[PDB]
Amino acid sequence: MVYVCHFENCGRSFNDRRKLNRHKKIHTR
Ligand SMILES: [Zn+2]
Numbered sequence: 114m115v116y117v118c119h120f121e122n123c124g125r126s127f128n129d130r131r132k133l134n135r136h137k138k139i140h141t142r
Contacts, residue, residue: 114128115127115128116128116129116130116132116133118133118136118137118140120140123139123140
């Protein structure tokens with residue numbers, strides 16, 4: 114349904130897992 118990348122500085126809301134599974138790159142390496 115909805116997914117909120119409320120990381121230790123982020124806060125991005127998304128309406129599918131694919132948007133989060135691609136946003137995760139902004140928190141990779
Ligand atoms: Zn995030």
